[PDB]
């Protein structure tokens, strides 16, 4: 199945979807009539092939001269998030689901673009320094201007946790120069190991009913959860608890036996981790209605994640903020103020109980589940929409 969760990052109206299309052919759709013209809310999904010519996009070597057929390397799946500074929660969720990143910078649009920088920062925070950098709108720029842009980018990427991350000049519309990108996908991104015995944990980003308009109820379908595994091969025929729960104010975890564990385009026996998977469960498709299973944790039955509202956070912050042009000073965190705490996939609205030296105690208005220590990206409301302040770990 899908071997490595590779994410796509860039500015809004630059062409992440376009890039995906160029790579795979699989469309992110762009939907709900708002997003048909403009920008997606959900993650965009695509399945790209790597079968190398060693003597590729398709498993045949008729194209690159030598008739010695395309030698199977990998199959990779995309994690394409919204690159808008309003919808950052989704991006954050994607980030602690990904194994590696793909940057997208346009030629004619500037080098210190705010959103892109923010994305980069997020990636750095959440252990995602494996970034393949792509020059995108180069089918517009001069023989000198492009070079200048590249130089500027290089200059920028000197103090960042990205040091010598590779840059490729592609056209997402004209279909050129993606060979290099493909090569890098095997070269610069090795897949981090993901075993059998590391306790099975599924991180849900999407809720899906496949209940088509027109059918009869004597021919029914269950609930499908679109979520990623980063530990534990889920096999067909297992019982599950989804632990952030269902709301009564108290919450109670949801129990579902596996109908299917579906990856690629064809349903499989297994779901080997480091991939984003559509899990058919006996759970109602009415709870998989639109975007209900977003930021929920799934464990195999006989397991104890903990649903915390009162949290011990170890926090770290910036000197100067991101999301804006206008990079504003980080004023100190203020008590009993609504922050957004992004933990793996959750985007919970939290109130500050205490501020110490490097630790903070937080109240959650919506309960999140901590199994391990859990990776956090933090966010705040200063300029209406949510800006990225810093990062944390749950000290548990």
């Amino acid at each position: 199945q899908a071997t490595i969760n590779i994410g796509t990052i860039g500015h809004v109206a630059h062409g992440k979807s376009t890039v995906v299309r160029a790579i795979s052919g699989v469309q992110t759709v762009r939907f709900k009539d708002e997003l048909e013209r403009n920008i997606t809310i959900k993650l965009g999904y695509a399945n790209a092939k790597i079968y190398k010519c060693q003597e590729e996009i398709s498993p045949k070597c008729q194209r690159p001269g030598c008739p010695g057929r395309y030698k199977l390397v990998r199959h990779v799946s995309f994690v394409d998030c919204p690159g808008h500074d309003i919808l950052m929660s989704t991006m954050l969720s994607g980030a602690a689901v990904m194994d590696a990143a793909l940057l997208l910078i346009a030629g004619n649009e500037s080098c210190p673009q705010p959103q892109t920088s923010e994305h980069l920062a997020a990636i750095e925070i959440m252990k995602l320094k494996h970034v393949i950098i792509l020059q995108n709108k180069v089918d517009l720029m001069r023989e000198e201007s492009a070079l200048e842009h590249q130089k500027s980018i290089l200059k920028f990427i000197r103090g960042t946790i990205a040091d010598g991350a590779p840059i490729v000049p592609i056209s997402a519309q004209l279909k050129y120069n993606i060979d290099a990108v493909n090569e890098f996908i095997v070269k610069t991104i090795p897949v981090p190991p993901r075993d059998f015995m590391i306790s099975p944990r599924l991180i849900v980003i999407r809720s899906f009913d496949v209940n088509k308009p027109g059918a009869e109820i004597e021919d029914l379908k269950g609930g499908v959860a679109g979520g990623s595994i980063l530990n534990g091969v889920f096999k067909l025929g297992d019982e599950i608890e989804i632990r952030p729960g269902i709301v009564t104010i108290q919450c109670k975890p949801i129990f579902s036996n596996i109908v299917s564990l579906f990856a690629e385009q064809n349903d499989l026996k297994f779901a080997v981790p480091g991939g984003l998977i559509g899990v058919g469960t006996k759970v109602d498709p009415t709870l998989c209605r639109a975007d209900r299973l977003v930021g929920q944790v799934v464990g195999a039955k006989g397991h104890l994640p903990n649903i915390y509202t009162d949290i011990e956070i170890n926090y770290f912050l910036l000197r100067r903020l991101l999301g804006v042009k206008k990079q504003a000073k980080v004023r100190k965190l203020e008590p009993n103020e609504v922050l957004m705490v992004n933990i793996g996939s959750t985007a919970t609205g939290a109130r500050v109980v205490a501020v110490k030296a490097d630790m903070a105690r937080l109240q959650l208005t919506s309960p999140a589940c901590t199994e391990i220590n859990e990776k956090i990206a933090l966010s705040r409301r200063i300029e209406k929409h949510w800006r990225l302040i810093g990062w944390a770990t749950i000290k548990k």
């Binding site: 089918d139 492009a146 590249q150 130089k151 000049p169 004209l174 050129y176 120069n177 290099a180």
Partner: peptide, 17 residues
């Protein structure tokens, strides 16, 4: 490195419509 990139860029420039 931005010089195994330079070659790529050159190639791209060569094969534009």
């Amino acid at each position: 490195v931005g010089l195994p990139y330079s070659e790529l860029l050159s190639r791209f420039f060569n094969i534009l419509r």
